[PDB]
Amino acid sequence: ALSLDQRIQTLAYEELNKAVEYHQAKAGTVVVLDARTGEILALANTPGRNRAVTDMIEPGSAIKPFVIAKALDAGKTDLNERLNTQPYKIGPSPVRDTHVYPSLDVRGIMQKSSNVGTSKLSARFGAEEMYDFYHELGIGVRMHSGFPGETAGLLRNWRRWRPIEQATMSFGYGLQLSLLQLARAYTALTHDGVLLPLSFEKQAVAPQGKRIFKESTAREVRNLMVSVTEPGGTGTAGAVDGFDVGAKAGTAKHVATFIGFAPAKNPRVIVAVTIDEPTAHGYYGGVVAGPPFKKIMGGSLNILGISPTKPLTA
């Protein structure tokens, strides 16, 4: 039986369509997954091809949590280390954040979505090691959905990586994956370190996945991601009243992305939104894709009957 939840699919289409029209965008896509089983609860596209599976995107900041999780999982950093986060170059190419942060701890690197912090964490691993990690998340691996135009994504051979390229990949540029591949990757965080396959069929139990991170790492990383949606974080537009939300906003003509899960401690749902070429009222992920994320997330939690874990303000 088909995994789509008609009430969540209707909600996803409603909110996706409102955002595309408001931002006078070319197109958009939403994926909603069950965060414990990998079942696809909603898959909505604006008219035309199934962009969720056909359109390769550079993930931008949405890849950062995985790099941080890897460095924690292998013991290459911990929650006490403060890193020098000044911008730098490798040859002629700069690596820089939106702002100049002198130093940040790992929780700060997540909260402020630091390109510098994340690239320095990635640099503690060899290129081959990082390449295998990206591969293991599913990047460059076809999903075989059967939809016309489906992309495998792009993961260049590690033998060709320059140091600048390893750095930029760690903050989400120079590799490419579909929104469906990216939403899949987030199951490694939500399902306590275990990547799930995804399914269009209803799953009576969670299927067999594969371990990417230790459970303790996945839990700690989910907790770090909560600071992104709280004041001081880069993803406050995706806050949902009454819940802790872990999310990232991303930008890559532009593509605006926002992806997240809730409740943060024990996730029920992943919601991922891309808006293609917004031309009005903003073009960054948080401004553009944050609001429909927020509405699809809060709406799905209500549909699925998940009680608020903290007090309602509004």
Pairwise CA distance, residues 176 & 87, whole Å? 24
Q: Give the contacts of 56 (CB within 8 A, at least 6 positions apart).
A: 151, 153, 154, 176, 177, 178
Distance between CA atoms of residues 237 and 234, nearest Å: 8
Say how many CA atoms lie within 13 Å of 240 toward its Cβ: 29
Q: How many angstroms is the resolution? A: 1.9
Closest by CA position to 25, among listed 264, 287, 304:
287
Cis before 263? omega within 30: yes
Could you tell me if 106 and 112 are in contact, meaning their C-beta atoms sit under 8 angstroms apart? no
Residue 248's alpha-carbon distances to 3, 156, 169, in angstroms, are: 25, 24, 16
User: 1-314: which CATH architecture?
Assistant: 3-Layer(aba) Sandwich (3.40)
Q: Which two tokens stand for residue 111?
A: 């909260």
Judge contact between 147 and 48, C-beta under 8 A.
no
The catalytic residues are 61
Residue 138 is classified by DSSP as T
**Angle at the Cα of 188 from the Cα atoms of 55 and 258, rounded to 5 degrees:** 45
Q: How far apart are CA 20 and CA 279, in angstroms?
A: 10
Q: Quickly list DSSP for 221-270.
A: HHHHHHGGGSTTSTTGGG--TTS--EEEEEE---EEEEEEEESSSS--EE
What does DSSP say about strands 82-84 and 88-90: parallel, antiparallel, or unpaired?
unpaired
